[PDB]
Structures are given as structure tokens and as C-alpha cells.
Amino acid sequence: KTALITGFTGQVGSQMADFLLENTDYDVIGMMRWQEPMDNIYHLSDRINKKDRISIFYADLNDYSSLQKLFESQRPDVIFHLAAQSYPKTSFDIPIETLQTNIIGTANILENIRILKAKEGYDPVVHICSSSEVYGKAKVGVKLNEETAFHGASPYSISKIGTDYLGKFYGEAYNIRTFVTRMGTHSGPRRSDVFFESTVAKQIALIEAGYQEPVIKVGNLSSVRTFQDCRDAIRAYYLLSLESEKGNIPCGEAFNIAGEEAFKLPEVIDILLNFSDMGRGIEVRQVEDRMRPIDADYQMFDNSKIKSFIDWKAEIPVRQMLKDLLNHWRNEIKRGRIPLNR
Amino acid sequence: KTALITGFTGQVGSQMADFLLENTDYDVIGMMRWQEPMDNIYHLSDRINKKDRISIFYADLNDYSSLQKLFESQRPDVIFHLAAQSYPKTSFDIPIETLQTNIIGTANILENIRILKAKEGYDPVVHICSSSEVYGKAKVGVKLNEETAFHGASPYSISKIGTDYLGKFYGEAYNIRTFVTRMGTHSGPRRSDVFFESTVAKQIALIEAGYQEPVIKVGNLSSVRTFQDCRDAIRAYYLLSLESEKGNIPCGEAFNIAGEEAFKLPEVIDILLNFSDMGRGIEVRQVEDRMRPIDADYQMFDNSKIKSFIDWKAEIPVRQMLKDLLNHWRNEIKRGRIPLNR
Amino acid sequence: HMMKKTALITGFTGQVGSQMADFLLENTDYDVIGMMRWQEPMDNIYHLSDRINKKDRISIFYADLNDYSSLQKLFESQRPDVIFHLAAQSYPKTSFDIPIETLQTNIIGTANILENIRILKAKEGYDPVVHICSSSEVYGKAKVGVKLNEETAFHGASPYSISKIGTDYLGKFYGEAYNIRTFVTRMGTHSGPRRSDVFFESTVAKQIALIEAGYQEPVIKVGNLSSVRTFQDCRDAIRAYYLLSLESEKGNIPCGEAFNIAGEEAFKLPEVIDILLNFSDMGRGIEVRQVEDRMRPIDADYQMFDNSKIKSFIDWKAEIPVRQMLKDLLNHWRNEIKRGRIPLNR
Amino acid sequence: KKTALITGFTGQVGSQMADFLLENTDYDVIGMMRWQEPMDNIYHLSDRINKKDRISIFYADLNDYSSLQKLFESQRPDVIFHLAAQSYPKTSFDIPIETLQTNIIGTANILENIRILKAKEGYDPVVHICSSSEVYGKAKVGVKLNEETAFHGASPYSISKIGTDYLGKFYGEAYNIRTFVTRMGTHSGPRRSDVFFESTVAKQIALIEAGYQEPVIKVGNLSSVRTFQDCRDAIRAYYLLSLESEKGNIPCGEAFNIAGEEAFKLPEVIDILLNFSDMGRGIEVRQVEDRMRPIDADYQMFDNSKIKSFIDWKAEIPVRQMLKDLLNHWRNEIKRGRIPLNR
């Protein structure tokens, strides 16, 4: 049984590889562009060099011919489509590449599968990763469900609305075993440095090592996020893929997935500062270049639909996930891998 | 005062240029790719050649640099963005170009305007044309209004969903005077041959001239729609454009726009056969190559929101619109411009 | 269950592809597939509509050069034995200000076609003959008084020129790398009654026809007249494409071989205007004016040819006189205006 | 203070051009990158960048025209080092569309933005368009390449630099934009990407030394000739050309071949890397199918007379030290647990 991971070098993809190698007998294929950063997969290199259950396929979301070669030659039984331009902030000023990679990237994958299904009966389970950002700037005091209206908060958000409709459409039109996951915040030690809890943790680490004045730079703190560790999120994807295989997930079925621990962003900063010998002496300053034209600033979740379909809960406390992320930046700086403060 | 029409060579765009020339003192710019069909605009060639109030700008939806030159050099005061891959049936097998031209083409326009507004205060009214097709296979019995949830019935439908959220987003994010129109079926003598009422009118005219056996080939008829002549639709667009300029349409506001008259598809056929001397002798046959993986179905009746912002109603009878279209195909065959039966 | 040699024409709705379809139906036993985007102008193919409705030897496949998935479907489902790849943004002048779509459609479009073929060859042994249509504009602004041959240095005179250099190298590369039976044709000017209105000899004939019919002042608007072109009727060019296609099938044309192809008759642009004016009763009374908007940042202003390579591989010369090609084009525009299909004067 | 833009700032050459400009000029430096690109080559710059000391970052993608528009409009660099590309021929074969898009259209996206700004406002930057000796593809044996050598399409990458090269010349000739085009040989050293021949040989030796690989180096075609120089010599050539162009001594769109003095058959490069290793005499070399190419640009020997006639320049760094620096880089990475793929 063969699993393809798109976005293998990313936060979630690299951890899905780890999870599948430790918890299944699956062969794993990691899709990447050849020059993608190795930071998340260095621990997998020897195993890949040894051809022990995991291999790399070189393909770009934006090269349909590369994806054709991948599906024709590898025929993955299950696909975790995690590859995307994942960052809303750059999507404002680089919106064309965000729309191309996320919407057209996903159409390039799904159309490749559709044609191979018509020709040869290829019938893979296809995980299409959407985002809770399809709900953009959601009304306060209400929890999100799978029928909550979509709001375009950013080109990234619109790109994920596109990804989402494509996932549902290809399932509904061609009976491909797609399911769509509208994820809240999933984080932990491999969270990209640009995301809120990771830039806060990283700036604390920079401050502790004397690289930055003891002022954390932030954007809008009037925002509510639900967190869980990727190690929990990934189990939900694996458990959904099994149900999809067994016939229990309708083609194109959508699911909101999040943790149970929700925070106003000042509470996350306070948790991270409490892990620092010098937290009592570190201030916070809102700066203009971290603000957004529209902020999707409220993500609270009713998880009743997902828990009705799989037997799953988040096990890792959010304080441990955050501590892991702070130690990660501490370790990078100690080793001379000085990050941007961004 | 200068008006840009994207999709100038198309059904609606060509008729919008006629409306503005007859009813306003506006200078008119028609955007086109140089090789576009001239069928809808032969009657404007003379006055274009003579530089009388209308001019052509050569640009492509997929060439940002061509749109950059358009907005910088011409600075239209109002923009009717009608250019699209308009046909759902081809969108199934040519999905990438539908998504690229419709979503990214719209993003190319809106990001060009955005940057010009930030640099020089350029503040045009921007009609972003979406479609009732965003509602796709609508939930039987829910009242259909501007807050009904979208459904992705085709790559076309998803591309107009994309277009819709781009229009909304660029309005909300950057205070660009966008408004989004979700129009029901508009038709009349310039309806492209491929659309339902056009292919039926066209096949009847082929049968009346002995080019086809007296069998009309159709797809699914278990569909109900509102119809309006384009010349009514254009009035609604024009009147909205005035309200947007006056400050009365919030940036990014969306509007469903339905005709007065609703029909089952067999009833549209019955109206067309009754304009034929040989109507009593023509069979209708459903064939597979006209069937769609998903067939959209919505009763979009409720115009209470558009009627609240403009003094407007469809005035032209649908029977006259369908007769005009049948006569168009009769005239085309009579001139030896024999169309495909498609 | 009767199986025929199948020809695909990309650019079926264009000047050359429309005439290639006519040629194959009259002179061969081939089934013809016309590739088009559905909304493409019908002007050049109205006379085929009845035949196509009747499923008599010619069909339409809807695909876009920029939609790889659409081409995959076309090659997988139809497996044409021979491909005339004529589809392009064909016009240098618009390429200056719409350069990205010119580069995407011509270079990436051609790459989408060839990569689809490469993959079907490796999997299933699909081995079509592939005509990759390039342009003498690969030589851009060539040194004056010298004949072009196939080893003449390339020059980038426009985004269109660079797109056809890209198209040309892709044609040679897929041939040399994967043993796809490509050949590349670097054509001079081929014209006649379906020449698009924007090209020199077409705009000049169109303007004369507008003047005769009372739609224009007796001034023809032109750009740079210090330019040399070699002309042949498309009806002669398509014969060369056909005969080269048979030689590729036969193993006589190495994968990715390039050929310059052009007519016998070369002219300075004013001579072309005088030939067309001499076909008009209004001809002695019409002035010629250079206007800024028909000028170009760089003009590929010299195209004369050593045709020795193509004539050594096929038994072929242009037979239609250019005066007859030009007369047919003027009569086309007269007919168009008579029928109320009033063109732009562009 | 003069403003320099580097595209491909995170790459082998861009990152070293930033080092070179900071050390040798009073130029403000702008590094273009997509936000997620590898930090490997620029970690040593993060603190400078954080403290806004002469170097900054602008987020743009070659394939997003609007992002490049914001860059030239807002930042108006006086000099541009266009080094960003899909740089690798091997992946270009099976990922050809992205190579063509990023390299040809990416360059068009840059040059068209500059054209429109020059027309409107008189923006007149110097524009280094980096091409490749691979425009000459599979060249004739026994003959040096020069600027008039016939072009040959050896790979989608090769064709993508042919496109890039013609765009460089065209935008210069058509619009009098101060472009120059550089068709480089092999420039290498410690930041050389792991997939390239001398970097994969040197990396595989390091994996063998540290016990991560059997003592067999996997290679492709060894019947190939290359001319090497250290990137620290190449970047000096680009800089000197940028001064000449600013003075008005480089015709708009002028092309230059640039390469070092030291040429080698590939086996000779392997033998120099093995002699740096205590395990040298013990390691086999095995040609493998998955490193072979449909066409190989087999032969890169250079006539450098044109470049030496326009700037006062030659390669100074011996290629032996260049390869030593590369081998020691892969030793350090492995010793620090940054275990590379063996590809």
C-alpha cells in the first residue's frame, strides 16, 4: 500500500512521513521540487538513501507533465495533498502565485487522477487539505461548522476556497474518493518561522541570545485561534483516509478539524514568555508591516461532524506544542542558523 | 468620461458598447485579443475606423503586462469586466484554462487597479461579472438570495466562484469600487451557438434548411431557469455603475439579477418550435455527449436586493428574445455561414 | 471498424490549418481532426460545417495550447498518425505589448504538445510524424543582401520571434532527445485569400477594398516600407508540409531536422502595393502614408532564401503566381465588404 | 548610496554576490526571495538584515508579475543581478514546463516591468541577465566556444536559457535598456547545490567517509569536459561589467561568454576529490542509468578574449582549493547532522 505526500518538506508533510513510517506498513513517496529546504527531512535522508520504505518523486504543482509522470509511474493508493503557498501575509502582494499554486496546482493533481481513473480504474483515496480560512473573517460568539458561509479574507483564503470547491467537485462529478479538511491552527516544532506562535517563539529565542532588543514585534492581537500539534492533526488525516478506503466517506465530503484549546493571541505570548527566564522583562509592540488589509481573526470550532466519522482526539497539550517550538528556535540560534526576525 | 468593456467581442460586451454609445456621452474602449471573432461588432467597424467615441485596446486576460499598459495609458473611469471562458461544457475537459482565464484573469485586472489606486489615487467603478452559476446544484426548496451558499457544479462554476470572491475581497480590502453581479440566463440574437436556447434555435434553423434530420439533440431538460434579453441586463449593470460612482454601492457588494419570466427547458423548446412552420414535425432527443457530470439547478427568482438599490425591471419579453435568436440562425444559414450542429 | 490514417491540425481555424484541412480532404484518404478552442472564429471553416455535422472524414476536438490536460485527452483518445502544429499567436506587432501570452502560447503551448507525445511514446510506443511550424522570423533582422539558409544565426526581433526560436529549439530537442519524428519549418510569407487582416499584404488589400466601397479616404496607412519579403500562396506551402510529412514517415527526415521554406518571388513592400493598386480602378488616385502606430521597435526587414535544402528532400516548388495570390486576397476583402462584414482598417 | 537588487539571493551565486557587494562597495543590497526558500546560504546575513544594516529582503516570485511590479516601482534598483532560475538541467527533462515558465517568462516578467517604468519615468538601471554556456548545448569537440558559436538545445533548461538570452538582447536592442548577457561556464565552490556533478561527487565522498554509504560513488556520463572557476571570481566579473555598463561602455544587450582558465575531463575532477580523502584509493565509481541524460552538453572549452577585452579580469582562485572548500562543506554538514540525500 503506497502513500504519496505532496508538501513532504513542509511542516505537516514531513511529520505525516514520520507517522506513516512508525504506525503503518505503507511505502511512502515524498513529492518535492529538488531545491526545497531539507530542514524537516534531514533525519530521513539516510533511510531514503537506503531505499527503506520511503522515496522522493521530483514534481512541481505548476507542471502538469511532472504530476502526470508521478501518478502514471507510482499509482499511489492514498494521497495527502498538503503542498501549497501556505502563508496568508505574502499572498496579499504575491497573489497570482498563491492562486496559481493552490487552485491550479490542485486542479493539475485532480484532473491527472480523473483521466487515469477513466482509462484504467485508478481509484485512490485523495486527501485535499483546505483551511478554516475558507470562513475568512467569521462572526464572533458562534462556533464554525461545515455549512458556515465562506469569506475571502486574503488571496490565500480565496485560493483555499478554490482548493475546497475543486476537492468537493472532483469527488461529486467523477466519484474520486476525495475528502476536504478545513484545518484550524496546527503547530509544533516544525512550524514555519513566519506564523504567529513561531515568530513569537523565534523572537523570544533571538532576545534570549542577544540578537534582538527585548520587544516582540506583532500584528493584530485581537484574534482567536484554536491550536493542536501536527502530530494530532496527522492522525485525523490517516483515520479519515481509512474510512474513505472502506466506503464510509462520501466522495467530496468536507470536514472542519481543530483542537479543543482556544486562545486570544496575548494568552499564547504569555505561555511562551512563561517558558523564558527573562519573560518578565520582554515587551510586545504592534508594528504596521505585520498588519493585514483583512484579518481572519476568529477561529472557534464545533468538531461534532469529524468525531461522528472517526474515533480521534488531540492527545498533546498546546503548552507542550509551544514549548517544543520555543526549544526549536533556541536550538537553531545556538547552532548558528540565525533566522530572520520576520 | 471613459468606459472599458472587457469581452467587447462577446454577447453582452458588444451589446454594452451599443448601449453606452446610444444612451451616454461616454467614450468607449473595447478590450479584445486581436484575432477574436468580429461577428458581434461588424456594425461598429466604421465608427471605430473613424475614431468616433469608440476605440479598441489589445490586451489578454492572461497577460498582466498588457492589462498594466491598458489601465496606466487609458485610466477608464468605469470597467465592465465581462471577459471570460463563458461555457461550462468545455470547462469539464479544458478546466485549467477556464480557471486561469476566469480566476487569474480577474486577479490580473484587480491587482493592476489596486497598485494604480495606491500610487496615484485611480478610483474607477469596477463591475465584476459573476454568475447565478455560483449556486450550482442548489439545495431544493431553500429561498435563493445573495447569502445562499455556493456549490461547484463545473470548473466554470468554480471559476465564477473565484471571480466572485476576488471582486468582494478587492472591494473590502482596498476600497476599490467593485460590485459583483450574479446574473441568471441572459440571451437574445448574439447568444453563442453552444448555449441551450441557442443550440435549439440553431438546430431548428438547420432543420428548416435541410442541413439536419428533424431531431433536435439536447442534454438534460430537468432544469428550471429565469431568462432575460441582454439589453435589459446591460441597463441593470449601467444603473449599478451610476450608484457605485455616487457612493451608494458598498465596495464589493454582490447582487443576484434575475429576469421576470421562469421556464422549464422543454417550454423554451415549445416556444421555439411554435415559431417554425415545421414545429409539429421535430422530435427532441437526449444524447450522452450533451450530458454533464453535474447539472446545475436553481430557481433564482428573488431580485428584492437589486430592486432596492436601482429602479429596474426586465422590460423585453422572452418570446421576442427567443424569436430574435431563431431569426439570427435563419439569417446566418441564408448567408452561407453554416454553423456546427453542436 | 474501418481504420484510416488520422491527421491532427492545430490552428484549424487559421489561414494555413483551414487550407491544410481542404488539402487533405481533396488529395488524400486521411481522416482530419481540427483542433480548436470552441469560440474561435468560424470564418475559414463555414464551408466544412455541413461535412463535420455529417461526420464525413473531418471532426473537431476542443483543446487549448495552454491547457495541458486538454491536449493529454486529445493525444490519448485520438492518437493522430501525423500532427500539423500550426496553432500560435502568429502576429509580431501585438507581441511587443502582449509579450507574456505570445511566449506562453507559442513556447509553452509547443512544449505541452511535445511532452504529451513524449510520455505516450515511452508508455505505448506512439510514434506520430510531428510538423512543428517555426518562422523565418527566427533569423529576425538579418544582414541585407544575403540569402537565409538553415545555419544562418538567429536574431530576436520581437517577442513573437523569440517565441518561434523557442518553438524551433523544442521541435529539434524533442526529436534529438526522444526520437519523436519532428521536423521544423522556418517559413517565409505565405498568403492568399485567408490571410489575417492585420498582416501587411492583407491590410493593404483590405484598405484598397474599403476605399473602393466608400469606407475610407483614398490614403492607405502603412508602417515601414523598407522591407523585403518572399511570398508564396498557402496552397503551395501546405503541399511542402504534406510532402515533408511523407518523407518523415519514410525515415528520410532525421528527428528534429529544420528546413527554410519560401516561394520564388521576392519583392520590396512598395512593389506589393503597386501590384494591388494596379488591380483597382481607383488605383492611380490613392496615396500611401507611413503612420507611427504601424512602426515596430525592431523590424525583421529582410527575408530572402536559399531553398537548396528543402528542394533536395522533396520534389516541390511554388507554382501559384504571387500576383494571383494578391488578386485573390483583394477579391476576398471586396466580397467581405459587399456582405456587410465591414473590417477594422487596422 | 547606489541600490543593487539580487534575484536568486538564496542561491549559490546570489548569496555570494551579496557578500561581495557588502565587502567591496557602499551599495545598499536588496535580496529578492520567495519567503519559504532555503536559508542555508544566508544565515550569516540574518543579523545584519534584522538590524537594517545596508541589506534588506523583498518578497517576490519570478512567476508573479504583480510582485515584480511592486519591487521595481517601490525599490527602483540602480543595478540588477538577475540570477534567479530553475538552474538544474537533470530535473528540467521531466519538469520541463516549470523550467521554461520560471526561466523564459520569469525573465520576460522582469524585463517588461523595467521597459514600462523606463517609458513612463526614465528608469534606466543596469540589468545583468544571467544566461549559460548551455545555450551552446552539445558543442563540437576540439574547438573553443565563443559568442558567435551556434546555439544547441541539449535540455529544457538549455532552451530556457536560449529564451532568457534572446530576451536579454531583445529588450536591450528594442528599448535601449542597459542589459548585458553572461553565458557562464561551471562556477562552483562551497555553496554549490548538492545535485551538480562536483558537489554530488564531493558530497558522496563525505557520506562514504562518515560511514553513511558503501565506498562506491554513483555518477552519470564521465565523457564530458568542463571549465571551472570559483563563484568568487565569477561575481567579480559581473560587478566589473556592471561598472562598464553604467559608464556607457557596454552596448545594450551585449553578450559575453565567461569561464575560468582550468579545464578538466570529469574523471580528473573525481581523482582530485579522492586524493583529498584518506579513503581515496579505496572508492569505486559506478555509472548509473538514473544520472544519464537524453542529451548531454559533453564539451565546454572557452575562448574568453571578448570578456578580457571589456573588463580587467581573470580567475585567481585555483580550482583545487574550490573543490577542497566544497568537500569540506559536505564534511561539516554531515558532522552537524544535516545528512544530505546522496542524489
Ligand SMILES: NC(=O)c1ccc[n+]([C@@H]2O[C@H](COP(=O)([O-])OP(=O)(O)OC[C@H]3O[C@@H](n4cnc5c(N)ncnc54)[C@H](O)[C@@H]3O)[C@@H](O)[C@H]2O)c1
Ligand atoms: N499548518 C496549519 O496550521 C495549516 C492551517 C490550515 C491549513 N493548512 C494547510 O496544510 C497544508 C500543509 O501546511 P504546512 O504547515 O505543512 O505548510 P508548509 O508551508 O510548511 O508546507 C508547504 C509545502 O508545499 C510545498 N510547495 C509549495 N509550492 C509548491 C509547488 N509549486 N510545487 C510543489 N510543492 C510546493 C513546499 O515546498 C512545502 O513542502 C497546506 O495546504 C496548508 O495551507 C495548514
Ligand SMILES: NC(=O)c1ccc[n+]([C@@H]2O[C@H](COP(=O)([O-])OP(=O)(O)OC[C@H]3O[C@@H](n4cnc5c(N)ncnc54)[C@H](O)[C@@H]3O)[C@@H](O)[C@H]2O)c1
Ligand atoms: N449571458 C449569460 O447567460 C450569462 C450568465 C451569467 C454570467 N455570465 C457572464 O457574463 C460575461 C459575458 O457573457 P457572454 O455571454 O458575453 O460570454 P461570451 O462568451 O459571449 O463572451 C466572452 C468574452 O470574453 C473574451 N475572452 C475570453 N477569453 C479571453 C482572454 N483570455 N482574454 C481576453 N478576453 C477573453 C472573449 O473574446 C469574449 O469577448 C461572462 O463573464 C459570463 O461568465 C453570462
Ligand SMILES: NC(=O)c1ccc[n+]([C@@H]2O[C@H](COP(=O)([O-])OP(=O)(O)OC[C@H]3O[C@@H](n4cnc5c(N)ncnc54)[C@H](O)[C@@H]3O)[C@@H](O)[C@H]2O)c1
Ligand atoms: N502565414 C505566414 O506567412 C507564416 C509565416 C511564418 C510562420 N507562420 C506560422 O504558421 C502557423 C499558421 O499561420 P497562420 O497564418 O495560419 O496563422 P493564423 O493566425 O491564421 O492562425 C493561428 C491559429 O492558432 C490558433 N490559436 C492561437 N492561440 C491558441 C491557443 N491558445 N490554443 C489553441 N489554438 C490557438 C488560432 O485560433 C488559429 O487557429 C503559425 O504557427 C504561424 O506562426 C505563418
Ligand SMILES: NC(=O)c1ccc[n+]([C@@H]2O[C@H](COP(=O)([O-])OP(=O)(O)OC[C@H]3O[C@@H](n4cnc5c(N)ncnc54)[C@H](O)[C@@H]3O)[C@@H](O)[C@H]2O)c1
Ligand atoms: N553556477 C553555475 O555553474 C552556473 C552556470 C551557468 C549559469 N548559471 C546561472 O547562474 C544563476 C545562478 O546560479 P546558482 O548556482 O546560484 O543557482 P541556484 O540553483 O543556486 O540558485 C537559484 C536561485 O533562483 C531562485 N528561484 C528559483 N525559482 C524561483 C522563482 N520562481 N522565483 C524566485 N526565485 C526563484 C532560487 O530560490 C535560488 O535563489 C542561474 O540563473 C543559473 O542558471 C549558473
Ligand SMILES: Nc1nc2c(ncn2[C@@H]2O[C@H](COP(=O)(O)OP(=O)(O)O)[C@@H](O)[C@H]2O)c(=O)[nH]1
Ligand atoms: N504571521 C503573523 N501573524 C500575526 C502576527 N501578529 C498577529 N498575527 C495574527 O495571528 C493570526 C494567525 O496568523 P498566522 O499565524 O499568519 O496564520 P493564519 O491563520 O494562517 O493567518 C492572524 O490573525 C494574524 O493577523 C505576526 O507577527 N505574524
Ligand SMILES: Nc1nc2c(ncn2[C@@H]2O[C@H](COP(=O)(O)OP(=O)(O)O)[C@@H](O)[C@H]2O)c(=O)[nH]1
Ligand atoms: N449547452 C447546452 N445545454 C443544455 C443542452 N441541453 C440541455 N442543456 C441544459 O440547459 C442548461 C443551460 O446550459 P447552458 O445553456 O450551457 O448554460 P449554463 O450552463 O447556464 O452556462 C443546463 O442545465 C444544461 O445542462 C444542450 O444541448 N446544450
Ligand SMILES: Nc1nc2c(ncn2[C@@H]2O[C@H](COP(=O)(O)OP(=O)(O)O)[C@@H](O)[C@H]2O)c(=O)[nH]1
Ligand atoms: N502588419 C503590418 N506590417 C507592415 C505594415 N507596413 C509595413 N509592414 C512591414 O511588413 C513586414 C511584414 O509584416 P507582417 O505582414 O506583420 O508579417 P511578419 O512581420 O513577417 O510576420 C514587416 O517588415 C512590417 O514592418 C502594416 O501596415 N501592417
Ligand SMILES: Nc1nc2c(ncn2[C@@H]2O[C@H](COP(=O)(O)OP(=O)(O)O)[C@@H](O)[C@H]2O)c(=O)[nH]1
Ligand atoms: N549533476 C550530475 N551530473 C553528472 C553526474 N555524472 C556525470 N555528470 C555530468 O557532469 C556534467 C555537468 O553536469 P551538472 O553539474 O549537472 O552541470 P550542467 O553543466 O549544468 O549540466 C554533465 O555533462 C553531466 O552529464 C552526476 O552524477 N550528477
